[PDB]
Amino acid sequence: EFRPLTLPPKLSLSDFNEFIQDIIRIVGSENVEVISSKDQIVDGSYMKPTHTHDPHHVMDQDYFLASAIVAPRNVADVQSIVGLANKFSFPLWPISIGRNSGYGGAAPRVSGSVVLDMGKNMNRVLEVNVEGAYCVVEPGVTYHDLHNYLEANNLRDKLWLDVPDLGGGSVLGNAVERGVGYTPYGDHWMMHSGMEVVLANGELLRTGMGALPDPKRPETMGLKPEDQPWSKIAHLFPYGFGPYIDGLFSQSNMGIVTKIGIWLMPNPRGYQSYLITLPKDGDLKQAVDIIRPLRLGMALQNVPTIRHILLDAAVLGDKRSYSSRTEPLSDEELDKIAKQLNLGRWNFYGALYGPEPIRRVLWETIKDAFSAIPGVKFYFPEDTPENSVLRVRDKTMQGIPTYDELKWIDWLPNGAHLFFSPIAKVSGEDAMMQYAVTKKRCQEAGLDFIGTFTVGMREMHHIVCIVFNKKDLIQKRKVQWLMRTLIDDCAANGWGEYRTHLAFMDQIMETYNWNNSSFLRFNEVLKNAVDPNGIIAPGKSGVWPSQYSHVTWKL
Amino acid sequence: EFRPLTLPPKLSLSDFNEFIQDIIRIVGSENVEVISSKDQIVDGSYMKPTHTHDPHHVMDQDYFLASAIVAPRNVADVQSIVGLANKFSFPLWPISIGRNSGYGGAAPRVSGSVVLDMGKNMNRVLEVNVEGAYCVVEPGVTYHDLHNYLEANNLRDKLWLDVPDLGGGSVLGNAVERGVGYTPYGDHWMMHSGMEVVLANGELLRTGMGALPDPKRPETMGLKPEDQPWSKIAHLFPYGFGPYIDGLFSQSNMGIVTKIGIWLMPNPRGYQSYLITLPKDGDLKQAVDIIRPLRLGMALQNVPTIRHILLDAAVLGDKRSYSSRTEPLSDEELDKIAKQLNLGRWNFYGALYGPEPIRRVLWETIKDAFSAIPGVKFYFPEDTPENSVLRVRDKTMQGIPTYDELKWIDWLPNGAHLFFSPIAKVSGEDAMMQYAVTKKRCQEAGLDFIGTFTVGMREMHHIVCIVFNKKDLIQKRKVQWLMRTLIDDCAANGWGEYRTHLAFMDQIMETYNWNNSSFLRFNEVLKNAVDPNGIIAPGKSGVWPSQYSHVTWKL
Amino acid sequence: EFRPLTLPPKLSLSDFNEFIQDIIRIVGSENVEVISSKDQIVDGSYMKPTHTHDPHHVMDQDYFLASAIVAPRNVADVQSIVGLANKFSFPLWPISIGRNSGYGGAAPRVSGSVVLDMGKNMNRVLEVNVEGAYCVVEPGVTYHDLHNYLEANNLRDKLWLDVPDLGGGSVLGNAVERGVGYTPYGDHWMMHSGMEVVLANGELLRTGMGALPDPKRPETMGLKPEDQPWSKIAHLFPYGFGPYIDGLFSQSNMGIVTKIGIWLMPNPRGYQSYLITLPKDGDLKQAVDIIRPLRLGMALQNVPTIRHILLDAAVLGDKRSYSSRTEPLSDEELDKIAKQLNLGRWNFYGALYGPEPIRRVLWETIKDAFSAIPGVKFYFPEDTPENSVLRVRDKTMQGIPTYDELKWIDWLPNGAHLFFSPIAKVSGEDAMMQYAVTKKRCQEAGLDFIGTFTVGMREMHHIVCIVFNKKDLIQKRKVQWLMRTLIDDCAANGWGEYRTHLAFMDQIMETYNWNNSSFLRFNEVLKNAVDPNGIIAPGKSGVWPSQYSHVTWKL
Ligand SMILES: *Cc1cc2c(cc1C)[n+](Cc1ccc(O)cc1)c1c(=O)[nH]c(=O)nc-1n2C[C@H](O)[C@H](O)[C@H](O)COP(=O)([O-])OP(=O)(O)OC[C@H]1O[C@@H](n2cnc3c(N)ncnc32)[C@H](O)[C@@H]1O
Ligand SMILES: *Cc1cc2c(cc1C)[n+](Cc1ccc(O)cc1)c1c(=O)[nH]c(=O)nc-1n2C[C@H](O)[C@H](O)[C@H](O)COP(=O)([O-])OP(=O)(O)OC[C@H]1O[C@@H](n2cnc3c(N)ncnc32)[C@H](O)[C@@H]1O
Ligand SMILES: *Cc1cc2c(cc1C)[n+](Cc1ccc(O)cc1)c1c(=O)[nH]c(=O)nc-1n2C[C@H](O)[C@H](O)[C@H](O)COP(=O)([O-])OP(=O)(O)OC[C@H]1O[C@@H](n2cnc3c(N)ncnc32)[C@H](O)[C@@H]1O
């Protein structure tokens, strides 16, 4: 409790101690973990994450690190700490889950900060409404939970989730992060309606229609604002009236979110998952010119994703279990692998939704569509092996949370994922053009290119999956080089990343430099006005309170 | 030029004069119209709007009024004036079109303000890209234009708009206002990607991916930031990286928008409009419980709208041309009218989109769906008269801009529309429950209830259409009473309005009072930080720069 | 001493401790009670009140609560603490008595505050002057005391008090609260002349003529300002010269009052109390049209009060001792009760004052007046039973303090009074019109309407007496609902409450919203200027120092 390994800025030890003390004096000694010595070395697991730092560590492991961690027990709690963080100018690092792995996990941008483990005690499914087809959750509600909640309330037969590759993340955190999932409810952020947050001054706020208060009633009298129910329309319409501010709340540091309204997808009455294996590495090109109008025409239902063989392969076994060769794999061993598995070089998964008479037609147009690609082959989970990736993806394209993809995090003995994610047009050319670049460097990096193009409706997210050995300093540096390098090129070409690890937020935000950082600047102004003190997650999205030296702080 | 009828606050005449002078000294005498005497009495037309005030005037006609008007010729212009408005603390009232009729039109919230007729000279279709299925426009681009643009470039066969009941409004303004249209691209605001605005400090900003700058090239050298092209992804992905600020830009006074990226809907390959007449006033109830899961299942394509007989009737002829009776019409004369027209009490229009094999099925489920409603009857524009509303709605549900609905603005000799628009759940009950309230007051008001429920996907917008005689002070007051009254009740019931005339922004913003105006307050803080001086449209969405007395200002 | 259960805002534990320490270091350990654990559960009694909170608790019992309590021993003391409250920004909650029960008692608006038990040691009758017919008192002087003081100085034969229903309250506190009593000296606040208060800066002030200092004299040399006598005219004329500021001192948080000049009523030379029972519930109507011109003509002497049967009945026995029926009593059981007691539905008490030749005439006009009401019946305490309410009221209408009315606080097993008190015109219509509303809700509330119209000379105070069970959370919520509900309606009708419990000060102050809170705003400005720090009773009368989030604070 007395002497963490790292103080936040300008902070005195006594102050830390007092601050930390009052905090124990509220959330309970149970709710706080002070980080006193390096024996923190304990990185974690995906099963039970470390909140102190970056598990997959690229910089010094100990580089981005908490001074201590706090489990607020309830909103009022969050409110009080904000007060203290304000009294002492101790800044906070709020997190729901811990899982922002491949992005930094629980590690705070600024070291010596306070990690606000929000999900610990705030695990509630506040509500699930069928007629509205939505749910309301706390940070702590992981996807699996949100799911089991449905199962145990026999709702599955009426409403469905939308999960990301992994089952464990916070439904809530992922949404503010603007994460991605598979069904037609894939765009997480967009699926929200009505949120709540403890702004910096410690004041509570609820968005959109969340502002229009539920009328009064004998049963609702005297409940803290926090515990008050919401208005009817709160979660069925996100806008409200006048300035639509929710966005200041995603991937920013404008506030601490306590709750959120997530739309649920009504069981559609028909579902069919599949694969369309692509034979040549260059097929990736025509496939896109293909996938393009189908998605826009909505012939393409959920989010199409087109996987690189190894992703699947890695999902399948370690790199070693395929070729004990320190260098990266030859254009040739892939094909060999591509065949060993019955996959392509490129591997397109999707799903059809609803009444079969329409699923049937759609498939015709698609199946019929991808036919111009030679050696193309179509499948249904049944037409494939038991360890089959497509197997998992079927649960996936239907809200069922897996955990199997993690295994690809295993390719290299010390696995640590990291993802580069320039966004590119749905153009086979551009897709190809992008890729070339990406791969080339992975090469240069001593790296196996590994990645996928998830298809947005009018844009495409290229996720370069960089595993790397968390213990080989030589490689990690190679990775940092690679990273920052790719960032530069991408932008050189006009492609921005849309999400990133802690260590690159800056470089990333700077790419977005039109008219002289005009945007960053605007932002700063707003962060200032609202977080006069910088307590809330300074450095996020590379945004810094004036209290922070851009000089001492950026990277 | 010398002596407008109204000065903005704390402004001296000399100052006005100097301010106004320098302004002529840039935009040209052509670009400015000084409002010197009441002979402004000239209200307008929909064909060529008055910018000085509120055409359909509820308060004193002259109540909300410009001191003068200015047509910025180009962005730099807008930038300079901002400077002047800042030099003199003269505030501005930016408008694209002029058409915000039923909301106030060109009338500025604060009188003596400067009306910034943005659309006058900034009429450009900057771009339309087919592969992206989007366009980029200036305030001045009205819908008809955006349309004729397609026609004259033979694009109609590939891309389609999404219009509101009327053809003339600014595509751009309507979007920031969060307006509504008919096709599946009905949600205007949501269809935007990449915008540009002159913030208050006069600095330019482009959102999302608009921040990621187009790489350099010999042909783009030396163009003002304003004239620079955009990045590839600029208009195909709205988010960018870090804080998603676009929303601060809709229905707010955070900035002056110069341009915007609007998604275009690719010609779908099949379209079928229709009507399903509802016989009993109470049918409105079951219809909704009906429409509800179809929209969520997406069986329901574009935005369903369920019209009250009179809307159609009024679209059809004046109230007099149906019953010279100063009082409002009897539950009975309607039915009589409902029959005279072949319509119902309630009248549901929609459209099917794409390949007939799917249109066909959909219609079955729908046609098949509404069958539980007795006396229900289905139609295609062909199955109806030539003056038929459905005729117009077919052009409408397909991006073709009409002008015919205006005629309903004619019901009462001096027609002036005004709309009340509580938002309610897609629940027949609630729908009914809402309505009751609404109508009851229209009664009390000496008013014909006239309205419609446009169906949002998970919420429903009830548009009460209040015509009223712009010259009968007795009635107008009745209307104000009605208004403010309805506002109170609605909220009493938990329904917020989402858009409103100038004269009620306040009352409206106040309904949104959860946790003590927590939201309004937050907003104010942001407006402050960014418009330290209050020049930009103070009072909008009922948000006021501290420079403004809430005491002297609210209503 | 070390760890109260609640800190005031932004306060650190060490600070509390230091603050609390210095305070012990002056007023004595005897004078302070630190609130360390929930074992505070001890609500109290009317005989010896709890200062920590709200005895009759509507919100969480523990909702509004002290951090500790302090008994300043003398003014200098009050002055020093003010200093400390200022040094630490610890705010204060000053109280004389503790009895503000049905309003909150000793509970501070803001929890974690310091309760300033002023009356503990400042119990003095500083003076009673016969020729002036006034007295001067400290907070601690309860009414009984002020009375016994007269008895033991044989003054009763020359001067008389004016008590409220209860004997125990602070004569002083009740006056600043603008309380009410029975004789012609019923308007407490108005009976004051010359007061003294420790303003926020810790500086002492004496009002009106209190400012004109008593000339110097050998015997008065060197006495603290506090102990200095007053000028002659100090207590016989309230105004002084220039701005009449006393009012900033009643029901506000502009200062801590240490003393006050209260006018005494000279024994009048004749007194006769009585009752005029009203038979029908609707008699209440004509009675008022009756009582109206008599009061204005002054035929009506003291404050007439017209009681609802149950008040008397409850004064008489518990509800159970009349009808074991969880629901509220039938219009019928009342009449039955009304008869069981010899009372009416409505029950008008009063008194005649002075020389019999005039009392005699008055009574004629009155007796003669109420004769138009059928079944009307007149009485003198003698014409009634021993447990008779009128018995008590005779002592009452003559300054003699009872304690018997408390028993009505007993109707329901866990008794807790609360009072709603819209003010209405002296119009039988309005009176009736008001009542209807009030009762209707009590209904809805599962509540027995219980109340009375005390007649002001040109306005009438309707005191709805809500008992309710302090342990039944279901009911309490019902009460809050009821409350806030009634508040809304009343105002809907144009009736304001004039006094209220802690938990509604806000809702109440907001009703008073003419011209946009113009008044509240003005007030705030003044509180600001004078209590730059907010230490003095923030939130009172719903007025909050800018140091206080209206967002975090209101209700
Ligand atoms: C390891 C991994 C990650 C991954 C994968 C697959 C694997 C094997 N899939 C594949 C993928 C990856 C990236 C992209 O772009 C697409 C696909 C994912 C997937 O399919 N879709 C995704 O969107 N992400 C995937 N990820 C990444 C990762 O698994 C997810 O992003 C997790 O959901 C993140 O973890 P979680 O524990 O939910 O978040 P947490 O550690 O709590 O941090 C959230 C961040 O947001 C802010 N924040 C969080 N909570 C709050 C609160 N309460 N208030 C305010 N802000 C909050 C913080 O800044 C925090 O840093
Ligand atoms: C008369 C009428 C109106 C109408 C109708 C039908 C009729 C007969 N239909 C039916 C309807 C009405 C309301 C609702 O809610 C639904 C349906 C409409 C329709 O089908 N859908 C609509 O969304 N609106 C309809 N309306 C209302 C009206 O016709 C439209 O809202 C117009 O599009 C508004 O006029 P326009 O000329 O485009 O706007 P303008 O006068 O320029 O003002 C825009 C406001 O927004 C801000 N703003 C505008 N330009 C800028 C710029 N450049 N920068 C910054 N802010 C800007 C301003 O605050 C301005 O006040
Ligand atoms: C329980 C009850 C209450 C009651 C009753 C009858 C019963 C059974 N009678 C009937 C009645 C009730 C309400 C109304 O409107 C009319 C009639 C009362 C009566 O006949 N007349 C009344 O005026 N009130 C009656 N009340 C209510 C209650 O009994 C009285 O209001 C008491 O006199 C209040 O208690 P007391 O102990 O005197 O006050 P205290 O707890 O010290 O608080 C006073 C408040 O004023 C401010 N304040 C107090 N002291 C100071 C000092 N020294 N400086 C500055 N401000 C001070 C504080 O804000 C404090 O909260």
PDB file of N, CA and C in Angstrom, chain A residues 18 22 25 79 83-84 87-88 201-204 216-225, chain C residues 10-15 59-60 63 474 477-478 480-485 488 549 551-552:
ATOM      1  N   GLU A  18      -1.751   9.044   0.945  1.00  0.00           N
ATOM      2  CA  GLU A  18      -2.990   9.571   1.495  1.00  0.00           C
ATOM      3  C   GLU A  18      -4.094   9.176   0.514  1.00  0.00           C
ATOM      4  N   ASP A  22      -7.377   6.923   1.517  1.00  0.00           N
ATOM      5  CA  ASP A  22      -8.781   7.289   1.506  1.00  0.00           C
ATOM      6  C   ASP A  22      -9.474   6.321   0.571  1.00  0.00           C
ATOM      7  N   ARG A  25     -10.131   3.337   2.292  1.00  0.00           N
ATOM      8  CA  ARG A  25     -11.168   3.789   3.209  1.00  0.00           C
ATOM      9  C   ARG A  25     -12.562   3.906   2.607  1.00  0.00           C
ATOM     10  N   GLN A  79     -17.460   7.810  -8.704  1.00  0.00           N
ATOM     11  CA  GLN A  79     -17.559   9.237  -8.455  1.00  0.00           C
ATOM     12  C   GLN A  79     -16.631   9.770  -7.397  1.00  0.00           C
ATOM     13  N   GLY A  83     -13.217  12.243  -7.587  1.00  0.00           N
ATOM     14  CA  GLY A  83     -13.002  13.361  -6.698  1.00  0.00           C
ATOM     15  C   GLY A  83     -11.579  13.393  -6.177  1.00  0.00           C
ATOM     16  N   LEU A  84     -11.119  12.242  -5.709  1.00  0.00           N
ATOM     17  CA  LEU A  84      -9.777  12.138  -5.183  1.00  0.00           C
ATOM     18  C   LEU A  84      -8.741  12.333  -6.235  1.00  0.00           C
ATOM     19  N   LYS A  87      -8.714  15.622  -6.360  1.00  0.00           N
ATOM     20  CA  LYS A  87      -8.101  16.320  -5.240  1.00  0.00           C
ATOM     21  C   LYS A  87      -6.597  16.283  -5.400  1.00  0.00           C
ATOM     22  N   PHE A  88      -6.048  15.103  -5.642  1.00  0.00           N
ATOM     23  CA  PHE A  88      -4.611  14.915  -5.842  1.00  0.00           C
ATOM     24  C   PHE A  88      -4.062  14.980  -7.230  1.00  0.00           C
ATOM     25  N   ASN A 201     -15.622  15.792 -13.811  1.00  0.00           N
ATOM     26  CA  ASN A 201     -15.957  16.569 -12.645  1.00  0.00           C
ATOM     27  C   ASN A 201     -16.625  15.638 -11.663  1.00  0.00           C
ATOM     28  N   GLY A 202     -16.740  14.373 -12.055  1.00  0.00           N
ATOM     29  CA  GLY A 202     -17.395  13.386 -11.195  1.00  0.00           C
ATOM     30  C   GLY A 202     -18.902  13.352 -11.469  1.00  0.00           C
ATOM     31  N   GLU A 203     -19.406  14.302 -12.255  1.00  0.00           N
ATOM     32  CA  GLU A 203     -20.821  14.335 -12.577  1.00  0.00           C
ATOM     33  C   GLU A 203     -21.259  13.249 -13.550  1.00  0.00           C
ATOM     34  N   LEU A 204     -22.430  12.640 -13.295  1.00  0.00           N
ATOM     35  CA  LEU A 204     -23.032  11.566 -14.126  1.00  0.00           C
ATOM     36  C   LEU A 204     -23.742  12.115 -15.366  1.00  0.00           C
ATOM     37  N   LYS A 216     -41.749  10.007 -13.126  1.00  0.00           N
ATOM     38  CA  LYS A 216     -41.785   9.632 -11.714  1.00  0.00           C
ATOM     39  C   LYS A 216     -42.862   8.632 -11.321  1.00  0.00           C
ATOM     40  N   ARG A 217     -42.513   7.892 -10.285  1.00  0.00           N
ATOM     41  CA  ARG A 217     -43.469   6.932  -9.814  1.00  0.00           C
ATOM     42  C   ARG A 217     -42.993   6.366  -8.498  1.00  0.00           C
ATOM     43  N   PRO A 218     -43.997   6.257  -7.659  1.00  0.00           N
ATOM     44  CA  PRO A 218     -43.921   5.799  -6.285  1.00  0.00           C
ATOM     45  C   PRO A 218     -42.857   4.786  -6.077  1.00  0.00           C
ATOM     46  N   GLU A 219     -42.703   3.876  -7.017  1.00  0.00           N
ATOM     47  CA  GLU A 219     -41.674   2.839  -6.890  1.00  0.00           C
ATOM     48  C   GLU A 219     -40.188   3.218  -7.154  1.00  0.00           C
ATOM     49  N   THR A 220     -40.036   4.323  -7.881  1.00  0.00           N
ATOM     50  CA  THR A 220     -38.767   4.904  -8.270  1.00  0.00           C
ATOM     51  C   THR A 220     -38.293   6.050  -7.390  1.00  0.00           C
ATOM     52  N   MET A 221     -39.093   6.419  -6.412  1.00  0.00           N
ATOM     53  CA  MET A 221     -38.652   7.494  -5.563  1.00  0.00           C
ATOM     54  C   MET A 221     -37.342   7.252  -4.779  1.00  0.00           C
ATOM     55  N   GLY A 222     -36.547   8.308  -4.677  1.00  0.00           N
ATOM     56  CA  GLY A 222     -35.313   8.212  -3.902  1.00  0.00           C
ATOM     57  C   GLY A 222     -34.104   7.346  -4.214  1.00  0.00           C
ATOM     58  N   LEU A 223     -34.081   6.861  -5.446  1.00  0.00           N
ATOM     59  CA  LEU A 223     -33.015   6.017  -5.951  1.00  0.00           C
ATOM     60  C   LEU A 223     -31.948   6.934  -6.477  1.00  0.00           C
ATOM     61  N   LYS A 224     -30.690   6.579  -6.230  1.00  0.00           N
ATOM     62  CA  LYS A 224     -29.642   7.416  -6.743  1.00  0.00           C
ATOM     63  C   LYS A 224     -29.804   7.485  -8.264  1.00  0.00           C
ATOM     64  N   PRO A 225     -29.408   8.600  -8.843  1.00  0.00           N
ATOM     65  CA  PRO A 225     -29.520   8.853 -10.291  1.00  0.00           C
ATOM     66  C   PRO A 225     -29.010   7.664 -11.078  1.00  0.00           C
TER      67      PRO A 225
ATOM     68  N   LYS C  10     -15.112  16.984  -1.087  1.00  0.00           N
ATOM     69  CA  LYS C  10     -13.689  17.172  -1.368  1.00  0.00           C
ATOM     70  C   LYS C  10     -12.893  17.132  -0.104  1.00  0.00           C
ATOM     71  N   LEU C  11     -13.495  16.598   0.940  1.00  0.00           N
ATOM     72  CA  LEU C  11     -12.695  16.608   2.131  1.00  0.00           C
ATOM     73  C   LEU C  11     -11.850  15.376   2.416  1.00  0.00           C
ATOM     74  N   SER C  12     -10.600  15.581   2.815  1.00  0.00           N
ATOM     75  CA  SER C  12      -9.761  14.431   3.134  1.00  0.00           C
ATOM     76  C   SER C  12      -9.957  14.049   4.596  1.00  0.00           C
ATOM     77  N   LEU C  13      -9.658  12.790   4.856  1.00  0.00           N
ATOM     78  CA  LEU C  13      -9.810  12.321   6.206  1.00  0.00           C
ATOM     79  C   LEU C  13      -8.891  13.075   7.129  1.00  0.00           C
ATOM     80  N   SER C  14      -7.639  13.250   6.731  1.00  0.00           N
ATOM     81  CA  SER C  14      -6.751  13.965   7.627  1.00  0.00           C
ATOM     82  C   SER C  14      -7.304  15.332   7.955  1.00  0.00           C
ATOM     83  N   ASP C  15      -7.755  15.994   6.901  1.00  0.00           N
ATOM     84  CA  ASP C  15      -8.319  17.313   7.079  1.00  0.00           C
ATOM     85  C   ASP C  15      -9.466  17.264   8.058  1.00  0.00           C
ATOM     86  N   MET C  59     -36.044   9.482   2.890  1.00  0.00           N
ATOM     87  CA  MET C  59     -35.037   8.939   1.989  1.00  0.00           C
ATOM     88  C   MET C  59     -34.373   7.848   2.826  1.00  0.00           C
ATOM     89  N   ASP C  60     -33.138   7.515   2.477  1.00  0.00           N
ATOM     90  CA  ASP C  60     -32.404   6.484   3.199  1.00  0.00           C
ATOM     91  C   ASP C  60     -32.340   7.165   4.580  1.00  0.00           C
ATOM     92  N   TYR C  63     -29.546   8.941   4.750  1.00  0.00           N
ATOM     93  CA  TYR C  63     -29.402   9.810   3.573  1.00  0.00           C
ATOM     94  C   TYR C  63     -28.775  11.204   3.813  1.00  0.00           C
ATOM     95  N   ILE C 474     -42.095   0.785   1.236  1.00  0.00           N
ATOM     96  CA  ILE C 474     -43.055   0.877   0.160  1.00  0.00           C
ATOM     97  C   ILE C 474     -43.859   2.177   0.241  1.00  0.00           C
ATOM     98  N   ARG C 477     -41.868   5.537  -0.173  1.00  0.00           N
ATOM     99  CA  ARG C 477     -41.687   5.888  -1.579  1.00  0.00           C
ATOM    100  C   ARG C 477     -42.988   6.506  -2.135  1.00  0.00           C
ATOM    101  N   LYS C 478     -44.088   5.957  -1.618  1.00  0.00           N
ATOM    102  CA  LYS C 478     -45.424   6.382  -1.997  1.00  0.00           C
ATOM    103  C   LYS C 478     -45.526   7.841  -1.585  1.00  0.00           C
ATOM    104  N   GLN C 480     -43.046  10.044  -1.145  1.00  0.00           N
ATOM    105  CA  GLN C 480     -42.165  10.881  -1.957  1.00  0.00           C
ATOM    106  C   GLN C 480     -42.854  11.158  -3.288  1.00  0.00           C
ATOM    107  N   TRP C 481     -43.479  10.088  -3.759  1.00  0.00           N
ATOM    108  CA  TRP C 481     -44.166  10.225  -5.015  1.00  0.00           C
ATOM    109  C   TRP C 481     -45.251  11.264  -4.814  1.00  0.00           C
ATOM    110  N   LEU C 482     -46.073  11.031  -3.803  1.00  0.00           N
ATOM    111  CA  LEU C 482     -47.180  11.905  -3.424  1.00  0.00           C
ATOM    112  C   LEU C 482     -46.722  13.354  -3.327  1.00  0.00           C
ATOM    113  N   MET C 483     -45.666  13.498  -2.533  1.00  0.00           N
ATOM    114  CA  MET C 483     -45.148  14.811  -2.361  1.00  0.00           C
ATOM    115  C   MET C 483     -44.898  15.603  -3.586  1.00  0.00           C
ATOM    116  N   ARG C 484     -43.894  15.067  -4.260  1.00  0.00           N
ATOM    117  CA  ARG C 484     -43.417  15.693  -5.466  1.00  0.00           C
ATOM    118  C   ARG C 484     -44.511  15.857  -6.472  1.00  0.00           C
ATOM    119  N   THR C 485     -45.497  14.977  -6.312  1.00  0.00           N
ATOM    120  CA  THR C 485     -46.643  14.999  -7.202  1.00  0.00           C
ATOM    121  C   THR C 485     -47.492  16.209  -6.882  1.00  0.00           C
ATOM    122  N   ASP C 488     -46.222  19.493  -7.925  1.00  0.00           N
ATOM    123  CA  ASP C 488     -46.465  19.799  -9.325  1.00  0.00           C
ATOM    124  C   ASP C 488     -47.836  20.317  -9.720  1.00  0.00           C
ATOM    125  N   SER C 549     -22.176  21.420  -7.202  1.00  0.00           N
ATOM    126  CA  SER C 549     -22.734  20.979  -8.478  1.00  0.00           C
ATOM    127  C   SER C 549     -24.275  21.003  -8.416  1.00  0.00           C
ATOM    128  N   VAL C 551     -25.826  19.887 -10.520  1.00  0.00           N
ATOM    129  CA  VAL C 551     -25.999  18.568 -11.111  1.00  0.00           C
ATOM    130  C   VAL C 551     -25.868  17.450 -10.090  1.00  0.00           C
ATOM    131  N   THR C 552     -24.824  17.542  -9.288  1.00  0.00           N
ATOM    132  CA  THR C 552     -24.603  16.529  -8.284  1.00  0.00           C
ATOM    133  C   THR C 552     -25.534  16.735  -7.104  1.00  0.00           C
TER     134      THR C 552
END
